[PDB]
Amino acid sequence: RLGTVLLVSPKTSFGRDLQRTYAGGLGTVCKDEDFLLPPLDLMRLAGVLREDADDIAIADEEVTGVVPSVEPGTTVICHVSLPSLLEDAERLATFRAQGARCYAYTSIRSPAQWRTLFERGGCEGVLLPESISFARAALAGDHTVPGLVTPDSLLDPRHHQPAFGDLAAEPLPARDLVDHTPYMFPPIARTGITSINGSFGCPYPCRFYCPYPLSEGRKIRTYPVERIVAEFRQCAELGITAAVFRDPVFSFHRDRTLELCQALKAADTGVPWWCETRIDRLDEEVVAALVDAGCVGVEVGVESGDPDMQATAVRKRLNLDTVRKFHAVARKAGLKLVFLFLIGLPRETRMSIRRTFDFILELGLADTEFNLSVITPYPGTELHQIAVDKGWIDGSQNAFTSHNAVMHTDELSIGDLERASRFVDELHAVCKAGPAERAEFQARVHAWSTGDA
Ligand SMILES: N[C@H]1[C@@H](O[C@H]2[C@H](O)[C@@H](O)[C@H](N)C[C@@H]2N)O[C@H](CO)[C@@H](O)[C@@H]1O
Ligand SMILES: C[C@H]1O[C@@H](n2cnc3c(N)ncnc32)[C@H](O)[C@@H]1O
Ligand code: SF4
């Protein structure tokens, strides 16, 4: 049945600097954001609903424009992020006041925030990642369905053990329902790029701070390679210029990765792609396979440039010399790189932060081959609860931008972390410039790390 359905990534005061897909689907906000990705989750929902829906459309109001109004009676699904949960609850109440049977889609696993969605937003339910596979039943009324949160049984312990349905029978995302031209991925193409998943979840212990296992579960759940190949053929046929994999650890299964590479090569879709993965799930053979299969580059997590931080707080048992050797193998194979760094994990000191910057300049990374995040305690992670029990969070959640200093540790004050927060803007500007700016930035960081005012 279903009737008219409109899936909307609502408008916010953040603009397109808000990228709802990142940080485990809770959203990042990065000033002058040039990684503008399409509303993948809404497209997957459209893909599963499209069979039993009279009409269905997708509206990224930051691109297509704000939906003027809705006709009363139709379903509206909004994408609620974390740093804009209030604005998206307001948009959800706006659709409710026009007789829309409102729903909400989010990766937020915090019954406290769901409360705000049923109260201000007035949602007949809240949809979570697990719900996508069953998104039909959810709107048919069934509530024993995973990923669907009523305001009734708002504290069922099923919503912290994400039961994932049969991923292999999921329809392809309705990528044909969205003009991909306004979507950008600078390291590959400036127009018409799309996002894609080949697997979900992550089992690693750095779930202490990272939200990806919280949003997606601690179990790797893969799609069949032949579905991903079908997606690449779909992208070529639609005229999409690039495909960006959102898998937290794309190369987790090594043999599966080589098989997927060979299959993508055989398909000869001529679609270039990008992926995210751990350094310790990459070796020379797998890198060669990726470059050969059409992968332009990878985002890998280094987090810190301080050896002791690697042996403790980073929780990856990642060695800095392994990072160096991987840098050599990746440049020597022509794979583009973006190293992912993190400032302000508990146990971090000034000299630790400075040694991170020291590592970034030692490696000689262009401005485009690194990204620095400021530690933000995402609700549902162990770090957020330890941060509450220690009065660590000084900022409000509408600044839970992955780049705003919003919490201090037992070793660092928000003045130190806000200072570093601005030092990352300095590092980008200074990496755009020449050696003379990088030596005077490296002087400042040394002086700031020593003194300890
Ligand atoms: N792909 C990872 C990476 O995402 C970043 C990306 O590296 C950066 O180049 C963009 N300008 C902003 C974008 N949020 O870093 C983010 C954290 O800052 C992670 O949440 C995300 O999964
Ligand atoms: C998924 C990527 O995002 C970064 N990352 C992981 N957890 C956090 C957090 N709590 N706050 C800010 N950035 C984080 C890491 O660098 C990782 O590589
Ligand atoms: S492996 Fe990557 S995505 Fe997974 S928890 Fe660790 S940092 Fe986060």
Automatic annotation (TrEMBL):
[4Fe-4S] cluster binds at C202, C206, C210. One of its GO terms (molecular function) is metal ion binding. InterPro entries: BchE-like (IPR051198), Elp3/MiaA/NifB-like_rSAM (IPR006638), Methyltransferase_Class_B (IPR034466), Paromamine_deoxygenase (IPR034533), rSAM (IPR007197), rSAM_horseshoe (IPR023404), rSAM_sf (IPR058240). It holds the Pfam family Radical_SAM. Residues 184-419 form the Radical SAM core domain. Its cofactor is [4Fe-4S] cluster. GO terms for cellular component: cytosol. It comes from the Bacteria. Keywords: 4Fe-4S, Iron, Iron-sulfur, Metal-binding, S-adenosyl-L-methionine. Signal peptide: none annotated. The keyword Iron-sulfur applies. SUPFAM superfamilies: Radical SAM enzymes. This is Putative apramycin biosynthetic oxidoreductase 4. It comes from Streptoalloteichus tenebrarius (strain ATCC 17920 / DSM 40477 / JCM 4838 / CBS 697.72 / NBRC 16177 / NCIMB 11028 / NRRL B-12390 / A12253. 1 / ISP 5477) (Streptomyces tenebrarius). The lineage of its organism: Bacteria, Bacillati, Actinomycetota, Actinomycetes, Pseudonocardiales. The gene is aprD4.
